[PDB]
Ligand binder design. Structure first.
Ligand SMILES: Nc1ncnc2c1ncn2[C@@H]1O[C@H](COP(=O)(O)OP(=O)(O)OP(=O)(O)O)[C@@H](O)[C@H]1O
Ligand SMILES: [Mg+2]
Lengths: 46, 530, 486, 146
């Protein structure tokens, strides 16, 4: 009971970390694929 | 009709129920978390809520209605005001949208984003709120102004408890003054329209719509509505709280609200967290439940009682949402699947259930009974631990624990007098000679019948179970008082003697193929009759 | 100082994160800003700078709701970090993160204010040697002695009289050491905060008409995460004033420390930082360190903190408790089982621990007595289980003298608190450190082998034991004399 | 400095576990791909370039030395942790301090069963090597007998 509890509490910690990592990887991929366009402002007016 | 003031921009992008706006010429500004109207049609508008204000001037919008009519390039106007919904005694008995619109069935304005009372404006929880169930009212007391969670797995009896609690107040509000009456607000979130209708019929059957209002944000409604329903629900309830009255808000359920908030945040590109939920999910629930309080006598003495409901998958209370709600509420009622399938309904797992308020939320009579009832049941469980084999021995604590755990089985809420009397009888040993199978029948005869009158033996002058107005006398004077103690014991002794002499004697003498079936049907009917 | 009253304009608003544009340059990080435009807000709005996006734009965390907030709204710097009042005028009062009295009991009338964020004491300001903090409680001062400049984890939820212990510590520290106390409610239920305030006023620790000996600082759940992550620092700043200016041994209660970690985690998520293991912020160790390190014993005074710890999912290896436990110099376990045994304070002596339980710090006699008590209690457990299979009559006479002394010890570690002189009716006791050591040392030897077992129940010191025994003997004699008459 | 000059030194890092957390904090603030337990991929290289500088220089270079005693914190006597294993894969031996022995009054609580020195045997003094040769067998038998 003390050996299967540790593996259950170690598993929940790893599961939370991996799922969060996956989401952030997708977030960074969709951020990287995005590109900023030409800025259409009155640059001279400054 | 939300009053539009000025054009703030034009729709640019649409992603399902989430939209973006680009600024109008001159870059006019719009207040944060305010209401906007998108001119979908020549004279029709779609409601939207401001959620993001980007640096470049873009605005994030949560659509609330008429989404199918929203298109890019449409014109947007702003109201410059927070969300205010109709509130008052004129809304009771109606189905209402989170936006305040009435939902057809087959007085003032209240802000939907308001702060909770401060420390000095609150008072200790002392007034009880009766759920109608012996188990809850005894082992998990609920007091007005308390926030009691109902956590359980699917199909375990969560919605039933809250509905019964709402119904149980009908018989009380009719007798006492409207000052102390409890007004109910049932919030359905992400449910089916069919379930709402059935609940509406069920409340109407017992005449609870007169004291109850239903706020529905069902599936097929945009997530924005499902995210605002609890806040609108408390806003309806806070109207009575700030006017010296008591309210009872039920949320069914917060699990679906969090999903909707997650959908909104993710579609608006906000930093996700654990289980993809945003970082404001805990703040979202806290500012919802903290609005339920018990005001001090200097502010009217009103209250709001919260009964959030949460679904735990595979009996896992380690989920992100469940833990956050548990850490906020003042206790929890845990409904267990095994007990529900085991015939124990309500299926409250008293071991895992808790009420941080404690006995302070109990009446004098209930408090006296519960003080000893809690002790007895613990011994029964401990001796029941040795009951897995070994031919458990029936000591008096066990002889009474079994009856207590059999009286807790009920379908409909119990009137206070009937419940308190039955518990007292089992507490003093009047059911020691009654078999566990016949307890429900014994209780039914005690409540809905009178053996003493039947056989012309009753000698009590006023104490009879058919006098339903003794409930308030019992509440004022505990059963352990000379005014009522003498007659109470006499009636219980007489009823117990007659039952053993006449009824249980015949039951033990049943030997037939049809009598046994008739007895079995009778016991089952009595199980769900009281 | 040079940025006092500097003007800026709101540039972005995303939830609780607000970006402000200053034409003259963003003020220093951790600077406080006030939103002058209160057009429709029911409360003032204050922002805290957390990041710099460019030479003119700065990111900030709102301490209140950002409703009815428009872009280009005017904002004014306050001239520095958040300022909190400090002094003897804050005693008996309730404050928030911004140091505003929320008790509606008149103006504070402080004479000085201090910034929330202050550097921890340097290595040269540390105390020369470790010293014990006499709490006046027999168990705490014997088996798990507290330490000045120490952080003590009060494990164990409610239902075990946790609040009563807190009030008793507040009263005893002022009574003996003349040091005040600051309570910080981080992410605490508003209902419980009200109950605690009423109890404190009832126990006279907060005397409205007299002199109080406790300050309250409450950041509740309904407040946004920006407040719950600074309330503790505000309370700590108040304690620092007493530690330095007045040179006292102050107390700092935190309820809880986990809520502080959770709040910073939410704040970090809002800013968009990538969370670390188990979803916690990457700065978890730094956030705790910047707080705990300020809690130490310096050459002027000391600040001993009693922090209420919560273990999520009952996992002691979780990063939050795991990082917290590294800063704790003592543990106090409160158990219902002990309370249900009638032992108040409900403390499990064998489950607690302390690092100053070493002869190099405490007196040698104290250490020897404490170890002897622990050994006897441990033996009492094994003997208790042996008799279950045998019966006490079987045990040896050494193990039947050791099962008698142990029971006396268990009864002698209970104590009646003066805070409960009203609701329990029994006069409280404040047992001195030396008195406790001598009393236990005599009991272990066997000097008090004739005193009845119950004479040690809910008493303070050894003299009280003798007085109770005499009263019990007198009562028994009178009852026997009356029986002989009839 | 002392090793390059032919002298000896002893460095005690207390502790490399908290260095990794700080490096992880820096990496995540820079938005770099998290690895196992969210630690960065080059966390191993962080300690490699550190401990490899601890060495015993050959006679030609002066016979200097920098002994290194890195410290590491486990959880519930877990030697399978990511950081713990990485350091164990770099050092030349390990001293394991079991919690149970420490709480049982057996201090310093050196769990000789798990501890080992992979290269230190040769450097052992002649006198202690004589005493320790038989001591190894005595302890080995004692553990088996109980
Ligand atoms: N006390 C009770 N005694 C007997 N039957 C009950 C009791 N409470 C509920 N039930 C029955 O159990 C079933 C489930 O009840 P309910 O609708 O309350 O479940 P729930 O918790 O809302 O589940 P879900 O909403 O996920 O479907 C229904 O058939 C209902 O009639
Ligand atoms: Mg349901």
């Amino acid at each position: 009971q003390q050996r299967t509890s540790s593996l259950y509490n170690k598993t929940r910690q790893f599961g939370i970390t991996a799922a969060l990592i996956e989401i952030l990887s997708a977030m960074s991929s969709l951020e990287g694929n995005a590109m900023k366009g030409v800025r259409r402002n009155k640059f001279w007016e400054g | 009709f939300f009053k539009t003031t000025e054009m703030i921009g034009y729709v640019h992008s649409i992603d399902g129920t989430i939209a973006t706006l680009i600024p109008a010429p001159g870059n006019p500004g719009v207040a944060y978390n305010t209401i906007i109207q998108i001119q979908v049609s020549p004279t029709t508008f779609a409601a939207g809520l401001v959620f993001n204000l980007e640096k470049d001037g873009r605005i994030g919008i949560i659509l609330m209605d008429n989404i199918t009519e929203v298109q890019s390039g449409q014109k947007v106007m702003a109201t410059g005001q927070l969300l205010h919904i109709p509130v008052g005694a004129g809304v009771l008995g109606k189905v209402v949208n989170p936006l305040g619109h009435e939902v057809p069935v087959g007085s003032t304005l209240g802000k939907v984003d308001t702060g909770a009372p401060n420390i000095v404006s609150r008072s200790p929880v002392n007034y009880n709120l009766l759920t109608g169930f012996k188990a809850v009212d005894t082992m998990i007391p609920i007091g007005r102004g308390q926030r009691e969670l109902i956590v359980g797995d699917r199909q375990t009896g969560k919605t039933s408890i809250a509905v019964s609690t709402i119904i149980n107040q009908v018989r009380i509000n009719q007798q006492i003054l409207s000052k102390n009456a409890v007004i109910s607000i049932y919030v359905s979130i992400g449910q089916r329209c069919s379930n709402v209708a059935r609940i509406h019929r069920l409340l109407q059957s017992y005449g609870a719509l007169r004291y109850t209002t239903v706020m529905a944000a069902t599936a097929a409604e945009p997530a924005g509505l499902q995210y605002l329903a609890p806040y609108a629900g408390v806003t309806m309830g806070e109207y009575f709280m700030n006017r010296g009255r008591h309210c009872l808000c039920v949320y069914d359920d917060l699990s679906k609200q969090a999903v909707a908030y997650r959908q909104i945040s993710l579609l608006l590109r906000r930093p996700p967290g654990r289980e993809a939920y945003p970082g404001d999910v805990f703040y979202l629930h806290s500012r919802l439940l903290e609005r339920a309080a018990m005001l001090s006598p200097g502010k009217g003495g009103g209250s709001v009682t919260a009964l959030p409901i949460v679904e735990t998958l595979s009996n896992d209370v380690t989920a992100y949402i469940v833990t956050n709600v548990i850490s906020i509420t003042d206790g929890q009622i845990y409904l267990d699947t095994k007990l529900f399938t085991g015939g124990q309904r309500p299926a409250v797992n008293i071991g895992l259930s808790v009420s941080r308020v404690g006995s302070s939320a109990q009446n004098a009579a209930m408090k006296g009974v519960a003080g000893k009832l809690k002790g007895i049941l613990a011994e029964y469980r401990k001796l029941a631990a040795d009951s897995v084999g070994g031919q458990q021995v029936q000591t008096i604590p066990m002889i009474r624990g079994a009856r207590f755990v059999a009286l807790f089985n009920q379908k409909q809420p119990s009137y206070f007098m009937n419940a308190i009397v039955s518990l007292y009888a089992c507490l003093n040993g009047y059911l020691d000679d009654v078999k566990v199978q016949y307890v429900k029948f014994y209780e039914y005869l005690l409540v809905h019948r009178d053996l003493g009158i039947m056989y012309g033996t009753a000698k009590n002058k006023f104490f009879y179970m058919y006098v339903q107005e003794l409930n308030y006398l019992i509440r004022f004077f505990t059963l352990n008082s000379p005014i009522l103690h003498g007659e109470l014991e006499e009636m219980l002794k007489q009823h117990t003697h007659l039952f053993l002499q006449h009824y249980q004697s015949k039951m033990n003498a049943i030997k037939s193929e049809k009598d046994v079936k008739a007895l079995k049907n009778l016991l089952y009917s009595c199980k769900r009759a009281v | 100082a040079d940025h006092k009253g500097r003007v800026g304009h709101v540039s972005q608003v995303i939830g609780a994160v607000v970006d402000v544009h200053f034409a003259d340059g963003v003020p220093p990080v951790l600077t406080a800003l006030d939103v002058v435009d209160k057009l429709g807000r029911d409360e003032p709005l204050t922002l805290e700078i957390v990041q710099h996006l460019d030479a003119h734009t700065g990111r900030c965390i709102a301490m209140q709701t950002t409703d009815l907030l428009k872009l280009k709204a005017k904002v004014v710097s306050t001239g520095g970090n958040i300022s909190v009042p400090v002094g003897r005028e804050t005693l008996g009062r309730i404050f928030n993160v911004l140091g505003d009295a929320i008790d509606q009991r008149g103006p504070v009338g402080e004479k000085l204010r201090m910034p929330i964020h202050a550097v921890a004491p340097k290595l040269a300001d540390q105390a020369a040697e470790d010293a014990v903090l006499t709490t006046g409680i027999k168990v705490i001062d014997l088996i798990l002695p507290y330490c000045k400049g120490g952080k003590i984890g009060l494990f164990g939820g409610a239902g075990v009289g946790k609040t009563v212990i807190i009030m008793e510590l507040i009263n005893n520290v002022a009574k003996g050491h003349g040091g005040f106390s600051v309570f910080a409610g981080v992410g605490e239920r508003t209902r419980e905060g009200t109950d605690l305030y009423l109890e404190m006023m009832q126990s006279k620790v907060i005397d409205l008409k007299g002199e109080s000996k406790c300050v309250l600082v409450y950041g509740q759940m309904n407040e946004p995460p920006g407040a719950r992550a600074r309330v503790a620092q505000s309370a700590l700043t108040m304690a620092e004033y007493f530690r330095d200016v007045e040179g006292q041994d102050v107390l700092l209660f935190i309820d809880n420390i986990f809520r502080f970690t959770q709040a910073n985690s939410e704040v970090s998520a809002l800013l968009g930082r990538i969370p670390a293991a188990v979803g916690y912020q990457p700065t978890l160790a730094e956030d705790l360190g910047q707080l705990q390190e300020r809690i130490t014993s310096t050459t002027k005074g000391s600040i001993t903190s009693v922090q209420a710890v919560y273990v999520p999912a009952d996992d002691i290896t979780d990063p939050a408790p795991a990082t917290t436990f590294s800063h704790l110099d003592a543990t106090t376990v409160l158990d219902r089982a002990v309370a249900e045994s009638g032992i108040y304070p409900a403390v499990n002596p064998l489950e607690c621990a302390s690092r100053i339980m070493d002869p190099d710090v405490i007196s040698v006699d104290h250490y020897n007595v404490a170890q002897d008590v622990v050994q006897m209690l441990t033996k009492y457990r094994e003997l208790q289980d042996i008799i279950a299979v045998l019966g006490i009559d079987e045990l040896s006479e050494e193990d039947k003298l050791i099962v008698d002394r142990a029971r006396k010890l268990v009864k002698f570690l209970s104590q009646p608190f003066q805070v409960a002189e009203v609701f329990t009716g029994m006069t409280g006791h404040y047992v001195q450190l030396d008195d406790t050591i001598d009393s236990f040392s005599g009991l272990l030897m066997g000097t008090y082998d004739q005193v009845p077992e119950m004479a040690f129940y809910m008493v303070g010191g050894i003299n009280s034991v003798l007085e109770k025994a005499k009263k019990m003997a007198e009562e028994a004699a009178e009852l026997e004399k009356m029986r002989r008459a009839r």
